Symmetry: C5
Subunit: 312 residues, 5 copies
Amino acid sequence: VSPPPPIADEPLTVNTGIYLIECYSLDDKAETFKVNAFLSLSWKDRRLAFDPVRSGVRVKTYEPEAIWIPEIRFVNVENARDADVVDISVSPDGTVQYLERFSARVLSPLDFRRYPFDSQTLHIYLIVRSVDTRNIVLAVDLEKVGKNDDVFLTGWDIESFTAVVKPANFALEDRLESKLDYQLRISRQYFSYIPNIILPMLFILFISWTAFWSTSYEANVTLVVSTLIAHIAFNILVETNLPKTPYMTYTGAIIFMIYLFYFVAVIEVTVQHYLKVESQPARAASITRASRIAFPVVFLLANIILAFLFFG
Amino acid sequence: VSPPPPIADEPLTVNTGIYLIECYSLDDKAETFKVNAFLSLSWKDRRLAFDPVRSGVRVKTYEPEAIWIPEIRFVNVENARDADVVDISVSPDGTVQYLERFSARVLSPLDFRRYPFDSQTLHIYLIVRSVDTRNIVLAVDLEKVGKNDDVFLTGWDIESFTAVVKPANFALEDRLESKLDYQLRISRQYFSYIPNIILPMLFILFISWTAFWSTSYEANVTLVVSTLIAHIAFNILVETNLPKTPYMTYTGAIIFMIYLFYFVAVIEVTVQHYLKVESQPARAASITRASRIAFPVVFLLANIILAFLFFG
Amino acid sequence: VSPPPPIADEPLTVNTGIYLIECYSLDDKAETFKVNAFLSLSWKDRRLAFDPVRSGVRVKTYEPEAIWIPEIRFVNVENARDADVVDISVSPDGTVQYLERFSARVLSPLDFRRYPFDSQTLHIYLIVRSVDTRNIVLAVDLEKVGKNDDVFLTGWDIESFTAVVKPANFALEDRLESKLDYQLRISRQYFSYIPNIILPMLFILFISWTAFWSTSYEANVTLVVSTLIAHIAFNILVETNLPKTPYMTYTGAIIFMIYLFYFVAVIEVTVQHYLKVESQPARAASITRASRIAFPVVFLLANIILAFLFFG
Amino acid sequence: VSPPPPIADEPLTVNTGIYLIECYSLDDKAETFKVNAFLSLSWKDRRLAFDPVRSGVRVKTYEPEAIWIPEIRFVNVENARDADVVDISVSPDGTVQYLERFSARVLSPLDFRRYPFDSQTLHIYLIVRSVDTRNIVLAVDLEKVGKNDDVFLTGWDIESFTAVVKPANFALEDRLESKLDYQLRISRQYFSYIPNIILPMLFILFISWTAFWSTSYEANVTLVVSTLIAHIAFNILVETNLPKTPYMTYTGAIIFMIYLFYFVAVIEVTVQHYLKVESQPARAASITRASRIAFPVVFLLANIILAFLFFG
Amino acid sequence: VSPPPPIADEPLTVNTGIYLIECYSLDDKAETFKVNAFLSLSWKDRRLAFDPVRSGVRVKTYEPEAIWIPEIRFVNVENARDADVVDISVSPDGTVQYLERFSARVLSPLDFRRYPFDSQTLHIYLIVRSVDTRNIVLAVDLEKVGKNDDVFLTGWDIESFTAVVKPANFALEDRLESKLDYQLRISRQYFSYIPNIILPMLFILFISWTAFWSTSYEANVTLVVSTLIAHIAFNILVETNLPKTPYMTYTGAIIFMIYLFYFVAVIEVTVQHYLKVESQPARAASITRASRIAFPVVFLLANIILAFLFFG
Ligand SMILES: [Cl-]
Ligand SMILES: [Cl-]
Ligand SMILES: [Cl-]
Ligand SMILES: [Cl-]
Ligand SMILES: [Cl-]
C-alpha cells in the first residue's frame, strides 16, 4: 500500500532468484524460447514486525493484497508473464518471503557463424523502477538459483545457469532503474546432422566425379546435371531451416563451393568433348588424367582452409 | 481459510484420483499432448463436523470460498490448468469430497530408437507444497482411477492407465513437497507405414537393380540416377515427420544403407563400362554375373543384422 | 441457489434443444470441427409461481443469478464452451424458459474406408450430473431442434440434423448421469477430385504404356522412369491430405496397384531387350504383342474387383 | 434496466450504422476475413428527458450501466465481438446516442467460377431479438455509413460499402427478430498472375511443340516428358492456393486441356516413329507437317471457346 | 471522473511520447509487425493542486481510478493494446504525469518495387476524441521519444524513430479528433541474398549456355531442359516468400527475362539441328558462332537497362 520509509537515506535492497522447471520451444527463425520457472523475492519491512512470544506464532501469512510488493518486470519478453502467488511469509524481525510460479516467452538473438557446431548464450533481464520516495536496488541470492534434473531441450544440451551478481544502474524516464542478468549456456547436438546431410552429399559428389573415367558425352552430361539437381534439392531442404543472416556462415560457404565445383566439372566435360571432336585425342586424355587427381585434392584443401578460417 | 490444525503431529493426507475423458493432439516434434480429465480430492477436517439428526440432512454442500482447499499443481505443464469446480460435499464426520474438470497441455519426452514399431510411456506429475503449520502428503485412491471407453488417440493404441502408489518426498525451497506419478502406456499403429513407405522403396530398389542385365551405359546411368532422385524425394518425405535425436535410429540406418547401395551400384556400372572399353569383355561379364547374385544377398543379410541389433 | 425439492420421489426433467447457426473448420487430420448454435433449456420450479392478476404481468424476467440453473456440459469438447445468456422467462405456473448462444470445438472420429466417396456422422453429447438431493434426467424437445438455411460446410453437403430421444443413464463417480446424442450426417463433394486427380493419372499411365510400340531401350527406359517420378509426385500430393489409418483404404490400394504395374512394365521392357540382344527377335515380338493387350485388360479387371470389394 | 414502455402499441426503432476502419486477412480457403469498425446506435427513451434550462447543461453523459441498451449481435461471426463503449450521450428530448469500436472475424462464402478475374460480395448481418414487452425493429442511417481512405486489402480493390435499407422480419424461437444487410464489393487484382503464371506456361508449351521439326525419337521423348513434369510442378503450385469447389472453374479447365494436349503430342510422336520404322517415310512426313499447323490453331480455338463459355 | 473545465475557451493539450523497447515479427505477406514500448502522457488539471508546505510532500500518487485520464487509441492496430499503468504522479501546480507499458500488433503497407534492396517506413497513429464539454489536442514531447540500444529486427537495420510535431485535426462522427504520426525507417539486409540466390542462378545459366560449343542434339536438349527445370524450382523457392503486388518488381522482371532467354536458346538449338539435317553445315556454324557472342552481351545489356529503369 506504501513503500517502506527509509531510516535516513539507505536504498531498499531486494534479493532475487530463479529456479528453472521447464524450458521448451526454441525457434531458430524467430529466436524465441519458452520458460517455466520459480520467482523468489525478499526485502525488509519493519512495519510488519511482531513479538513471537505475545502472538504465539513464529511465521505470519499474508494475502497478496494489504501488503506492499515491488513490481518486477522482464525486459525481453513478448507479453507480460502469467504468474500466481504461491506463498507469502513474514519473519518476526520484518523480513518478507515471496514466491511465485510464472511462464513467459523470451526473445533473444542468436549467432549462426558455426551453425552445425555452434554454442549459444540466452539472456533473461530483470528490472525494477524506483518510486518517488524510495530508491530500489536488486541483488542476487546464490542459494536460490538453479534448475531441475529433468529440464531438457529438444536438440540442445544444457551446460550451466548462472547470474551476474553486479547489477546495472541507470536513469530512464527521469527514474533510476536496476537491471540484472541471468545467463543460460547451451550447445547444439550435431550427431543427427552427419549421417543425414554430410555423408549423402559426399556420395552424390563422388557419383558426379565418375565422368572422368568415361568418354561418352551424353552419359557424362546426364550424370553431372542430375547430380546438380539433387544438390539443389538438398540445398533447398537445408535452407528451409536456417534463417538469413547479415554475415557468412560455414554451411553457405560449403554449398557455394559445391556449386563452383559442379560448374568447373561441366566446363571440363565440355572442353574434353570439344578437343575430341577436333581430332586431338591426346590433349583430352591428358586433361582427363590431370582432372582425376586435381579435383579431390583441391576439394580437400579448400575444405581444410574453410575449417581453419571458421574454427580458428 | 486456514489449514486444519493437527492433533499432535500427524501430517495431513490427501487422496487423489484422475479419470480420463479425452486425450488428443500428440505431437512427435514438440513432444506434447493435450488431456481432459476429472480431478478428485479428499481429506479430513474436523472443524466441519455436524450432527445429522439435529441438522436434518446427511450431506452438506459448500461453495469453493469460505473453505480451505489444498493447492495441487502439475509439474510438467506449459501453463496453469483451466479448471472448474463441479461439486463439494462434506460428510458428518468431517470428510470433504472434492471434484473438478480440467484441461492442460502436458510436456513429456519420447524415445524414437524403434520409431516405426515403438512404444511410449507418458507421465503426469502431481505435487503439493507444505504450509508452515501442517505437513501435507499425497495418496492414491485406486477406486477413482480409470478412463472412458471412447478415449482414442489418432495413430496410437491405449494399453493401460495406472499410478504409482508410493509418493516421492523431498525438500525444495525450504519446504517439504510430495509428488505422484501417473503413467499412460501407448503403442504405435504401424499398419499404414508398410504399403505407403516400405513396399514402394523395395520396388524402386529392384528397378535400380535391373541394370545388371543390360550392357548400355546410358540406360544404366539414367536408371540408377533417376532411382536415386526418387529415393531422395522419399527420404525428404520421411524426414519431414521424424524429429532429430542425439542417437541412431532404425529408419536412418536403413536410409544410409540404401544410399551406400546406390553408391556401390554406380561404382559397379562405371567399372563394367571401363573394362568393356579396354577390349576385355570377359572380366566385365564375370563381374556382372557376380553382382547379380551378390547385391540381394548382401542386402538381406545387412537387413537381418540391423533388425537383430535394434530389436534384440 | 438450491435445486427444487421433489414432491415425493419424482426426478427432475429438463427439456433440451439445439438450433445450429454456423458450422465450419472441419479438419480431416485432427478430426475436429467448430460449431455455433443455440441452447434451450426448460424445467419446472414451483417456488417461482405467481398470480398473474395480482402482479399485473404475464411473464417475469430473472437475471442468471438469484435462480437455480442446472449445469449442462459437453462431453467431446476440447475446452469449456463460450456462452452468454440471452433471455430467461418464467411462466405463472413455474415453468422456466432458458436460452443462450455458445461456440465450441467438437472432437469426433471419422472413417476413411471410402475416402473419395465417403459419408460421415458427427456426434454431440450432452450430459448432466445429479445432485445429492434430486435426480436429474434429460429429454428432447423436437420443436426446438433444427438448423438455418445458410449453414454451409466447405466441401461437404449437410443432409439432416436429428437427435436420439432415449437418453442413456449410468453411474459415474458415485453419481447418476444422463446423456443425450445429437447426430449430424454429411456427405463429401467428390466433383473436384475427378478432373484434378483421376484423369491426369490415367493420362500419365497411358503415356507410360506407349513403350510397347517402340524398340528403343533408352527411350522406353526414359518414358517409364519419368512417369514413375510423376506418379511419386502425385502420390506425395495426395498423401499430404489423407491421415494415416489402421486399415486399408481405396486410394491406397489403387496407388499400390499402380506401383505394381510400373514394376511389371520395367520388368517387361528389360526382358524384351534381353531377348533381342541374344539374337531372338521373335519371342520378344510375341511378348510385346501379348503385353499390348494384357496390360489394359488386367488393369480394368483389377479396378472392377477393387470397386466391388470396397463398395459391395 | 427495463425496456422503455410503448405509448400504445408502436414498436421501438433503432438506427444503426457501421464505419469501417481496418479490414484484413482475407483467406480464400477458409472464406473468412477480419474487420475493425465503429458501431453506432440510436433510439428513443422518454424516461431520460430533462429540462436544459433547469439543469444548466445541454447533453448528459451516462455510464453503460444504469441504462437500458439493446443487445445487437452479428450472425455470421465465429465468436462474439470484442467491443468497448466510446461515448454515450442523451439529448434533452430523450434521444440516446451510442458509439463503440469492435473487431470480429466474419464468415462468408465466395464464388471461384472466374478465379483469376473474379469479383466478390461480402455480407455482414446485424440482428436483434424482441423482448416480451416491446417489439424492436432496425433501421439504417445513411449519414453514418462509410469507410476511411486508408482502408486497404492485400490483393483486392474496394469498390463500395452500402447497406440495404429494408430489414427482414421473421419469427425465430417464438420471438420476432429484425435483420439487416451490409454489403462490401471487392475485385481481385490480376496483374501479378500474368507474368508469373500465364506466360511461362506458354513458353513451356511452345518448348514442348518443337519436336515436330525433329526426327530423333529420344530427343522428342525427353522434350515432351520433361515439359510434362514441369507442367505438373506448376499445376501443383497453382492448386496449393485454390480451394476445391463443387463446380468447374476456368483454371481447372485450362489445366485439363493442357494435359490433353500433352497426351495427344505423345501419341503423335509415337505414331510418327512407328510409321518411320516400317519403311514408310512419306506418311510420317505428311502427319508431321499437318500437326505443325494443327496444334496451335486448335489450341487458340479451344481457348477462345472456353473464354466465351466462362465469360459470356 | 469529469474532464477539467476550461478557463474560458482554451482546448486541453496532452503531450505524448513513445519509447521503444522491443520490435519483432515483421511479416512481409501480412504486412504486420509487433511492438513493445512505453507510453507517456501529460496534461493540466488545476482541481488536483495542493500546497507542498502544508501537505509536507512534493509529489502525490494516485490510483488509475478516482482521476480523469484521457482515452488514447491506436488507429492501425488489429486489436486493442494490452497495457498496464506503471506510475501516476501529480505536481503541486496540477500537472499530471502518466506512464504505461503496452504491446500491440501494427498493420502497415509496404512497397516491394526494389524488393532485394528496398527501404520501408512504418507508421503508428495516435488519436483522441473530443468530449462534449472540452476540446482535446495532442502534442509531441521530443525529450521522451527514443529507443533502446538493444532493439533489433531480424533481417533489417533500424535507422531512426521520429515523429511529426504538427497534428492533423478533422471532424469524424460529429466530433473533432486529433491525430499524430510516428515514423520508423528501416532498411533491408541484402547480404544473404547474393550467395544464396544470385550466384547459383548465374552458374546454372552459364551451364545452359555451353550447348553452343557442342553438335550433339540430345545432349543440348538435356542440358537446356534440365537447366530450365532447375530455374523453375528456384523460381518457386523465391515466390514462396514474396507476396503478390499490383505492380511490376525487379525480381519478377529478371525471372521473366531468364525464361525468355531459355526459350530463345531452345529455338536456336532447334534451328541449328534443322539446318544441319538439310545438308547445310555452314549456316549452322555461322549461327552458332554468332550466338556464342550474342547471348552474353544481350544479357548484360538488358540487365544494365533494367537496373537503370528500376533504380534511376
Ligand atoms: Cl513481466
Ligand atoms: Cl496446474
Ligand atoms: Cl461445456
Ligand atoms: Cl456479436
Ligand atoms: Cl488501442
